[PDB]
Amino acid sequence: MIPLQHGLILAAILFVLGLTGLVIRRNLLFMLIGLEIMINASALAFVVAGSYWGQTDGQVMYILAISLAAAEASIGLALLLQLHRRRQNLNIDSVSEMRG
Amino acid sequence: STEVIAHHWAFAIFLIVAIGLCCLMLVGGWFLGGRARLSAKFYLVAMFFVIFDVEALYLFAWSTSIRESGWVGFVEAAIFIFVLLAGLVYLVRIGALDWTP
Amino acid sequence: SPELIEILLTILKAVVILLVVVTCGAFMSFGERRLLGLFQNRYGPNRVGWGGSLQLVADMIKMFFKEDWIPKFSDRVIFTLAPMIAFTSLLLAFAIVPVSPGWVVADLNIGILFFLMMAGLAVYAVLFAGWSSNNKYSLLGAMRASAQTLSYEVFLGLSLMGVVAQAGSFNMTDIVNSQAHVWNVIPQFFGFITFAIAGVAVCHRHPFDADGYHIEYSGMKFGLFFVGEYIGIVTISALMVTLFFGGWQGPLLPPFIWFALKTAFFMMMFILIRASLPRPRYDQVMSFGWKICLPLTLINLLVTAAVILWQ
Amino acid sequence: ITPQNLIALLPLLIVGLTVVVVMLSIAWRRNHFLNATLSVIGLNAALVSLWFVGQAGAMDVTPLMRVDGFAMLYTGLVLLASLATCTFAYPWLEGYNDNKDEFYLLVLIAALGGILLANANHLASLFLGIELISLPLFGLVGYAFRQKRSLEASIKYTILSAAASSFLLFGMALVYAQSGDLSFVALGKNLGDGMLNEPLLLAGFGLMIVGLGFKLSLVPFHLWTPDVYQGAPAPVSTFLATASKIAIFGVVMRLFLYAPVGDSEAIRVVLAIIAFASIIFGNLMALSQTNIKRLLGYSSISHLGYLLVALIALQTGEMSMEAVGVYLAGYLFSSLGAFGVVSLMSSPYRGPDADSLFSYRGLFWHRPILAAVMTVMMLSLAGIPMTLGFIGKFYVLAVGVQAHLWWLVGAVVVGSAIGLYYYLRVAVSLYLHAPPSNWQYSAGGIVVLISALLVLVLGVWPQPLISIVRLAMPLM
Amino acid sequence: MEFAFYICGLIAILATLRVITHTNPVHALLYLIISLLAISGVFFSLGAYFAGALEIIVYAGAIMVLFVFVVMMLNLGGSEIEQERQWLKPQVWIGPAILSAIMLVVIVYAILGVNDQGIDGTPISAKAVGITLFGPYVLAVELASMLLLAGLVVAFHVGREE
Numbered sequence A: 001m002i003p004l005q006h007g008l009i010l011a012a013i014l015f016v017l018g019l020t021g022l023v024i025r026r027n028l029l030f031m032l033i034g035l036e037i038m039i040n041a042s043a044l045a046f047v048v049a050g051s052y053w054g055q056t057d058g059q060v061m062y063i064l065a066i067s068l069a070a071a072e073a074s075i076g077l078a079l080l081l082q083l084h085r086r087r088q089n090l091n092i093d094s095v096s097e098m099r100g
Numbered sequence B: 001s002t003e004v005i006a007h008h009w010a011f012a013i014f015l016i017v018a019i020g021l022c023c024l025m026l027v028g029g030w031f032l033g034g035r036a037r038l039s040a041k042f043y044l045v046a047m048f049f050v051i052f053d054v055e056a057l058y059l060f061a062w063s064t065s066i067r068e069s070g071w072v073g074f075v076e077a078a079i080f081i082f083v084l085l086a087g088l089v090y091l092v093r094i095g096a097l098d099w100t101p
Numbered sequence C: 001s002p003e004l005i006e007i008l009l010t011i012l013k014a015v016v017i018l019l020v021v022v023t024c025g026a027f028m029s030f031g032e033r034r035l036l037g038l039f040q041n042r043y044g045p046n047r048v049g050w051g052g053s054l055q056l057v058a059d060m061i062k063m064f065f066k067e068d069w070i071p072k073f074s075d076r077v078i079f080t081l082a083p084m085i086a087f088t089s090l091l092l093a094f095a096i097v098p099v100s101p102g103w104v105v106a107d108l109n110i111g112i113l114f115f116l117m118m119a120g121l122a123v124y125a126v127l128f129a130g131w132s133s134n135n136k137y138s139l140l141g142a143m144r145a146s147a148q149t150l151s152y153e154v155f156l157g158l159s160l161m162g163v164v165a166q167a168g169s170f171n172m173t174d175i176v177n178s179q180a181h182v183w184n185v186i187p188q189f190f191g192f193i194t195f196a197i198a199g200v201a202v203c204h205r206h207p208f209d210a211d212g213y214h215i216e217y218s219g220m221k222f223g224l225f226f227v228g229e230y231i232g233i234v235t236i237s238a239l240m241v242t243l244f245f246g247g248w249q250g251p252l253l254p255p256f257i258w259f260a261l262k263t264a265f266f267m268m269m270f271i272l273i274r275a276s277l278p279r280p281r282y283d284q285v286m287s288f289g290w291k292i293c294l295p296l297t298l299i300n301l302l303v304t305a306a307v308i309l310w311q
Numbered sequence D: 001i002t003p004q005n006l007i008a009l010l011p012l013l014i015v016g017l018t019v020v021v022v023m024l025s026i027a028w029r030r031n032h033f034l035n036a037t038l039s040v041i042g043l044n045a046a047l048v049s050l051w052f053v054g055q056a057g058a059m060d061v062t063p064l065m066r067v068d069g070f071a072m073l074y075t076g077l078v079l080l081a082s083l084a085t086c087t088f089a090y091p092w093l094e095g096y097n098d099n100k101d102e103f104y105l106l107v108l109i110a111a112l113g114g115i116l117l118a119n120a121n122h123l124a125s126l127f128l129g130i131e132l133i134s135l136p137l138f139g140l141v142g143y144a145f146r147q148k149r150s151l152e153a154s155i156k157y158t159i160l161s162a163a164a165s166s167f168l169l170f171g172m173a174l175v176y177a178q179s180g181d182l183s184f185v186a187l188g189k190n191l192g193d194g195m196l197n198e199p200l201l202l203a204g205f206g207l208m209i210v211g212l213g214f215k216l217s218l219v220p221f222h223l224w225t226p227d228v229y230q231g232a233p234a235p236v237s238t239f240l241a242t243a244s245k246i247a248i249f250g251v252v253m254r255l256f257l258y259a260p261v262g263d264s265e266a267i268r269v270v271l272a273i274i275a276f277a278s279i280i281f282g283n284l285m286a287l288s289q290t291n292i293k294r295l296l297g298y299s300s301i302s303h304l305g306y307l308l309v310a311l312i313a314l315q316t317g318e319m320s321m322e323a324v325g326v327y328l329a330g331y332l333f334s335s336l337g338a339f340g341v342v343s344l345m346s347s348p349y350r351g352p353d354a355d356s357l358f359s360y361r362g363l364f365w366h367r368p369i370l371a372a373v374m375t376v377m378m379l380s381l382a383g384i385p386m387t388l389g390f391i392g393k394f395y396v397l398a399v400g401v402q403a404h405l406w407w408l409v410g411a412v413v414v415g416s417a418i419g420l421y422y423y424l425r426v427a428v429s430l431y432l433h434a435p436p437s438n439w440q441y442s443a444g445g446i447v448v449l450i451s452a453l454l455v456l457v458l459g460v461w462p463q464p465l466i467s468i469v470r471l472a473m474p475l476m
Numbered sequence E: 001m002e003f004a005f006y007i008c009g010l011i012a013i014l015a016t017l018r019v020i021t022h023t024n025p026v027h028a029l030l031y032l033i034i035s036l037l038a039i040s041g042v043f044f045s046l047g048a049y050f051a052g053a054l055e056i057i058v059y060a061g062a063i064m065v066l067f068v069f070v071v072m073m074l075n076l077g078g079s080e081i082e083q084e085r086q087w088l089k090p091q092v093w094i095g096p097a098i099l100s101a102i103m104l105v106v107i108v109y110a111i112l113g114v115n116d117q118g119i120d121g122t123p124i125s126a127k128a129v130g131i132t133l134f135g136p137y138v139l140a141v142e143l144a145s146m147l148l149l150a151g152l153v154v155a156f157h158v159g160r161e162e
Ligand SMILES: CCCCCCCCCCCCCCCCCC(=O)OC[C@H](COP(=O)(O)OCCN)OC(=O)CCCCCCCCCCCCCCCCC
Pocket: B004, B008, B011, B012, B015, B016, B019, C084, C085, C088, C089, C092, C107, C108, C109, C110, C114, C121, C122, C124, E033, E037, E044, E049, E123
């Protein structure tokens, strides 16, 4: 009753919204938030694909995706805490010393 | 069916009555009456909770179908839980899971 | 049509369950006062009405007609939102409990999973109340309480996974149909005790309860926090009876009566635990949550799996 | 599940048991010597047990995993890279005032992900292997997080690799939506009669190409590479540049081999453009580099472009897999020796505040044998004959000529000339004029000297490497 | 089925749009939690009951709790960022917005030409997901345990105080 195309398009909308939030924001925290949005959109697309075929494989890939999301959110927030400790600001443009 | 849609209606009514009761309670509270740097240990504890929660989800999915997985599933869950306890022992022994030093 | 009257009868059953649960939470706030009096060689409130029965209505009116107050340089949406979470999360977690044959709100395929969802959402009440108050002491106290809550919610699910492993399904009716001969207090005794400690701890009860994060709350929001606490106590006790004590099963009395006496028994034990136990220190509480209870639940699930695969 | 399937799993099991054992040994006491020795013992044991896996044969251990001599060759390359990384890491970690033991646990877990990618036959296993080599690299790139450049590289690699993982996962989801099967061989099976180029399959493969080409430093997903290479610890730079690139290109090789959509002309044209741009841009950006880390990053971009040229000729040619194997052996030894000389001159770790500049000028007049090894690897990465890098360049040129990829062949020649300029600039700066003491630093010097001798010997005499790469065959 | 799916998808899109443009971090995290609840409702509409339960338990109940913890720890209130509002003026975001719109329209064009027999919505229970998860996918389970181990080790190594 639900089209597969509509679920895929919803996942794509959330993915490009997360990418936009990743690019436009100077604060590192909103960059991590956009990364979480993109990975949740990818997991949602896998759930839609698995539910269309009547397979468990979509939910299994969802489990793997949220395991990755948990690990990446942990590591990124640790790095953000380190940045706020060392430099007392979360401006990502100031972390730009290496160039050339 | 009939019983499943009756239960769907009952669950939806339960949801909306509970939410409306709380919101009405706060609305009536506002209406009536006359007027006149934290340490990183919090982050570490929340992070440990997240990691062990995902690993717990794997054990949740294991526990439902024990008699459909045989002894091989028990073996694989045994290596899973062994790595779980190895990580727990690693965290405890280094001071990660201690609020005070 | 019979379908329409069946739908309306089920809806009426769900609304009756919801009203009785909210009334039980408030009336057993009053009952907690009376039981603390009984346990402490005194009486408690026995003057407002017949036996103190109208004391709760007096408290409700007093908090209704108190002056509504929000701190000035504070967030409004988060401050108003935290008591709603503290009420709604466990009130909704009640919806999976089978009370008797023919009396259940939602016979979900997930059940226990819905309870875990509600507790995971329930931690946000403490976090939001601490942040929105614009007080450093309340914020620090809420972060402490939230860290403790996570420390016990991390093994709540596995402490119930022992029972799910024995039953082979997440459904609650199948779990209570798996108790027709032996209740899970005997085989899942480690699961029993760990769910007891976890259910006490995520409800912020004694002995699991930088000043507090409720100091800026007053009026009807404080009432929401406390009534949500006691509603969560009702829900946890009913879950405990459903999972480990057979639910509705009994030899002589009607099944609702058996469920009611067992739920009342465990709420009485909840208040007795409040009266008797002393409060441990923070680091001891987190260490007992992590070092002892989590490996205990993992080993309990492993041994349970080996035992059930033995037959 | 058979016990012979358990015999096919021994590198995975041995690396995982080394992970558990090293973790518990750290939990008992923090001893850098003992934990490092346990890590290299486990990696050496897995490298030895590859012989028992070879005696076991070749079989499909899961719907997920498939092990053949292709997988054992890639596993051996990844294990050798990891062993060299640990060997370079010990004299580096001697100067690290914080915990020196988590390094080896992350290196081992990354080697486990490399082994999974070596044996992966499934989109789930590919995603898992990608994430298993990525997240320990997040830890390792910013292991010295108090250092400003290492924290910068950690943040850059973590953010960009999370974004690329999202792209790869989204592409995998679209591919699964079209195909209904996450197995590699079914990616294009349900199509047919010239309907291979389905738009959703192509777009999913495009998003996976974005993620994997980030992981392979392919243009235009390449800008992270000099910054991350310069900021990362030097053994971490060695491990990234060797193990991550080799494992991910091995799994990309296998994916384009068994997927029926690997014969699509659109993906071939897009990968040809990416290879052309990677070769030209990586060679051109390294012309005026005085930093050896950024220079080697641009060099890695160019060398992965050459590898991609060998990848495009997969379906038309027959010697493409052998070309990738020989090129990857030469590239592994060359980058190992190069980043190893950088590592031992950056060892011991001097702290978060002091500079870590290489200063290769005049290296011969105070450290001559390492200067000789460094210029040998400069000649090898330039593709000069008497080096195995030339043998790989010759294989890439042979598969480009046989498949008539004349634009890529001309790109190889032109980028080779530009590479000659900057590589010879470095190699002759080693002998210009400029204005340790334990056995682990000597072991690192032994490792780079052995790799240089191997690249010289297989430059003059390449037949044993050709024979042992041809020994590896997949389950076609 | 379809009705709940469409409201939950619309709520998720709207909440994400409020997430990526808001200035207050706690408010943005609250909108992100709302979007996660909506995505779980979408999962329950499709029949992936385990996925919806996990979207509430794991994503909203653990990961967003970690983000909320970090934001409360740092006490973020726009240190010369809320005073600037650089991401709000169109001369900053007009490029990335149309770039994401172009990527979205290409992806949507690719999606629009595929076979679509319609999602049945028959519930794939967590028992079947467990049978598959400890049947054909056991290497994924073990290596995901090592994946979370790697993430835990990295996050402890980076997120200390000393
Ligand atoms: C402040 C407000 C926040 C938001 C509050 C909620 C907003 C929406 C309110 C209206 C909801 C109406 C009810 C929705 C339908 C209920 C029935 C249902 O979900 O049925 C589907 C499925 C049935 O499955 P089952 O019966 O097991 O199997 C047989 C299959 N025919 O059963 C399931 O899939 C059951 C699992 C899903 C149940 C979800 C219930 C609500 C969960 C959200 C609670 C939010 C709490 C507040 C915020 C927390 C802090 C942020």
